[model samples]
Target: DPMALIDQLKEEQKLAMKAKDKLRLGTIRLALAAIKQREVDEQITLNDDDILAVLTKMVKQRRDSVTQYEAAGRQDLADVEQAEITVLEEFMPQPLTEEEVAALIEKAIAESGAAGMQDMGKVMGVLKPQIQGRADMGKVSGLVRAKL
Candidate 1:
């Protein structure tokens, strides 16, 4: 099941090549390269959960770059990164809705017996594995802080 995502990327790459979708092809290639490089460095195969972490980081980094690019008045560069994000997101799990995220946060707080801001880490520790790659942790943190 984990390897299936990798195979799906390769299959998409072949299709992109045939379609001459350079932007999409390049994005997929970058993802594959990142995955391979991590495997080489760790000397172990990554499971789907691990791959999601890699992809999530890739998306988060690009989001930061997009903000920086926009602030610098470089919409052209920002648009390129946004396009790549669209392609990369195709491989990610569907995002959790706001209501679902809030419910999960509430559940995490209750489960962890988190009483205040100081217990944020305990709440996050309980929620991270369930919400990672499904919801934005930055926003989740804000919500958790508000609830606590």
Candidate 2:
């Protein structure tokens, strides 16, 4: 069932090719290649969670590139990176709001009975899968640290 996302990506790739949408097609190609490369290296099939992690990483990379390009006064390059991010984000889940993220972290901490900073791992283990694609884990970690 998790592999369904891969099949969906493949279908979109074919559609992009047929539509002659070079940018979309190229982005999809890169995504597929990333997924394939990971599978080859790990010798394991990626489930939906794993695929989401890959897509999230791709989005983060483009965001960083956009920032660097903007700093360099390369608006054209920044625009390209933004466009790629748009395409990559199509398959990602809608992001959680600040309130939602905070609430989830609170719930995870309580559920895990996290008492102090020493219990950070217990809270994160409960939160990671739920928040993976929908929220930034680094930010969530900071929030958890503040709460603890």
Candidate 3:
């Protein structure tokens, strides 16, 4: 099913060209490239779950780029990166609320017996995939930091 979706994206590439939509065209092309790279390296076809993992990583990288660009006084560059983030978000599952994330983290902390900051890694390792594409790990990391 996800492989079919990937195939559909390839077909949609033609639409971007016909529409002369440079931003979307570039974003979609790059997304496909990243997906293929992961697929090849993992030596396995990606299911939807796997695809979301790649997309989540891409979104985080673009968010970081937005911050970097803005810090450098490059608002235009930041805007471009934000645009790609928007495109990426379209395929992401529903965003998790801070409360929901906190609950999950709480469970993870309990399960791992995370007593302090040093135990954060153990908690994060277990929680990453549980919240994966549904939540922002950057925020989750900060939340875990505060909790520990």
Candidate 4:
């Protein structure tokens, strides 16, 4: 059987420890802590999809921090966030391109037969699973909105 994504992350953490790479080890531990915290609060085992969602959220948070740090002219802090983003993204699905996303959006709209703005929810529901973890839902929402 394939190793679980979280298991792979733990293995990487071990390697980082052996290499004495504090930055990589710290980032991996942070991601694992967030995953453990969510599982504890929800009282359930997280499957790969759920784990991906958690990682995606972590990336988003780090990106936001990167933006804020840059805005404050704190290149040092922004670099840290950027490094964490790189670590987190290793556990995520390959992100979708604009062309791929647009194609998927068109397909979702077609599948749902969404005729107007009110049917935007129908299109979105179809696209959610397809795009989640691969594409930003905010951008997908805007694409769906414009299409409708």
Query: 87-128 in candidate 2: lDDT tens per residue?
Result: 988887778999999999889987788989999899999988
lDDT of 3 by residue, 22-48 (tens): 988888798799888988888888877
Q: Per-residue CA lDDT of candidate 1, range 50-82, in tens? A: 777778888999999999999999999999999
CA lDDT of each candidate?
A: 0.90, 0.90, 0.84, 0.88
Task: Write the number of the candidate with greater TM-score, choosing between 1 and 3.
Answer: 1
Please rank every candidate by TM-score, starting with the best.
2, 4, 1, 3
Report the C-alpha lDDT of model 4 over 6-122, residue by residue, as the tens digit.
898899999999999999999899888988998899998888888888888888898999989999999999999898889888877678999999999899878778988999889
Task: Please provide TM-scores, in order, for all candidate models, with all chains considered together.
Answer: 0.67, 0.69, 0.61, 0.67
- Residue 13 CA displacement from its true place in model 2, Å: 0.1
Q: After superposition, how far is residue 77 of candidate 1 from its true place, in Å?
A: 1.1
Residue 26 Cα positional deviation in candidate 2, in Å, after optimal superposition: 0.3
The 10 consecutive residues of candidate 4 with the worst lDDT sum are 127-136
* Candidate 4 pairs with clashing backbones: none
Error of 2 at 69 (Å): 0.9
**Where does candidate 4 stray beyond 4 Å?**
96-148
